[PDB]
Design a protein around this nucleic acid. Sequence first.
DNA 1: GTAATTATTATTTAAAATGAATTAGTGTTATATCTG
DNA 2: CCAGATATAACACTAATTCATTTTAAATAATAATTA
Lengths: 138, 142, 142, 134
Amino acid sequence: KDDSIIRFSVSLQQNLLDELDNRIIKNGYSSRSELVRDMIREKLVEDNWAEDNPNDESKIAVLVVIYDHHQRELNQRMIDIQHASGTHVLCTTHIHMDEHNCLETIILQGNSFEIQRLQLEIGGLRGVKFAKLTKASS
Amino acid sequence: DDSIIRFSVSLQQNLLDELDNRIIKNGYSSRSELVRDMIREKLVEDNWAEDNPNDESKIAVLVVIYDHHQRELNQRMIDIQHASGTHVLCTTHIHMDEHNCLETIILQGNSFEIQRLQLEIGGLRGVKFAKLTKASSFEYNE
Amino acid sequence: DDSIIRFSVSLQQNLLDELDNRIIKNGYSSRSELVRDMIREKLVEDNWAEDNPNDESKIAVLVVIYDHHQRELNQRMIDIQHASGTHVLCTTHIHMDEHNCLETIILQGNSFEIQRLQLEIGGLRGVKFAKLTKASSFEYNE
Amino acid sequence: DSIIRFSVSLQQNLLDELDNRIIKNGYSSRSELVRDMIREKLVEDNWAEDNPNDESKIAVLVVIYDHHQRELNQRMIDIQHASGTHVLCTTHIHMDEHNCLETIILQGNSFEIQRLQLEIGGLRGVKFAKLTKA
DNA sequence: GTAATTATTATTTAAAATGAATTAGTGTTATATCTG
DNA sequence: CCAGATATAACACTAATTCATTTTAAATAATAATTA
Ligand SMILES: [Mg+2]
Ligand SMILES: [Mg+2]
Ligand code: NI
Ligand code: NI
Ligand code: NI
Ligand code: NI
């Protein structure tokens, strides 16, 4: 059904669940699920490609990422995704923060889907700790 | 000790469907990775909400769009960055068209001092767009 | 075709000895890699020296050092790049100190246009340094 | 002292590309050109090694590589993190399916700059590496 | 009592690791050129 | 043809890299136990 109440499982570090649980009460939340739902809704609103500007003409965007370069086959995956994406990727500026942290600004060209897709495909990778898209126009 | 544990989430079917369709089926590796990334997302905005001048491991990216034709605009922007008490790491510039320039200014330092640049640079005549991406490093288990 | 072949080279023992000393002293993966790299090196030289405004596949990096204090120097440089017939891919800027700025300008186009951009930018008052790195793409079997 | 021989493994196209340079530049054999190239490499590598002023210099390393070369990208980032304080930033351009351009901005004295430079150009898959000192 | 939320265990799936098969790199021996 | 020589080809062996394999862990499904 549409309204039916379902469950889904998530595998993660104890540290991360603790950090999540630590946030339930203080922000005026009754349940862990109640919070997770709002976070999902939050992501669903920020990762919306249409309604920003119609006809989805090629726009310019900047994707800010943070990842651990130690993560096995992560860089190979990221560069492979970007090469597969051709002209949609203008360039990447990288900062080696510390031994387990890399800052990277990926400058993208494309329509609302194309950009959204890249934010999700790169951000979706295991080891990519942070990914925030800044949308402009081109 | 840090080990991998599980946990279930109760929600409407239509909400899980929207999550799977709009995000996991549109590139995301797993539902668990998204949840982890959403946790990391909130974990970051906490560090930035914590206005402690001791921490400088709060890295940020300022995305700016401007017309280079605007007199003294590039002169003033570079002046602000050189003057800055914050460590401006580097700036990547894209010449979009004759009247459009994109810059990504990578900054380090104090929350207020970094927002001061966003305020200063964004405030300039000819700076059409200015958005700050508040970011930070993460531990090996984060 | 995609096939790995071998070939012998006759020379004095002392010349091979001093070659293998620089392979260890500079830590190159293999002797074959160095031979391939110096063939590639010579091939880029040849590509550029054969001045033909037809080849627009040529990639180059222009390294500049200047004083940002020099009035409208930054506006003129960006004007030069926007005006440029070449494809200015991007520019990375480093604020070295109060009177020093480092920029790496990635260019793609024909030898002449890439060089006019060097002539112009390097010619500017306040430009303390300008060195062009003439590079090129290489095919799978190169 | 005495004349000895050595083998080199490479792609047929690259040897073909090399063989075209012989007559065209005034050489008798392939070995003649290879020797001359070795002699040419050994001279510019010596003057670059000498004159080490222990001053705070900035340098740019321009590299070209094939990202298809298994984890070459990972290796490069490992080298750069290993001497992190020196490496200011890296700008990457995805040229085509088999070409990547990177500009690595380095900081330090002659000795600590040469250490980092050679560690990257030496890598298998790194087709081009040219430093710019300042 | 009902129903949503957590916890635990099971099944599916993706990541590591292992090791044979293969390939790349270099040293050695042999044939093809070369010069006068 | 010739010495008397280097240049190139062929062959051989060794270090390195694939790839298909097994092994291990992570991601979801299912279900049981709790809490509203
Ligand atoms: Mg991720
Ligand atoms: Mg190489
Ligand atoms: Ni890094
Ligand atoms: Ni511009
Ligand atoms: Ni500067
Ligand atoms: Ni690339």
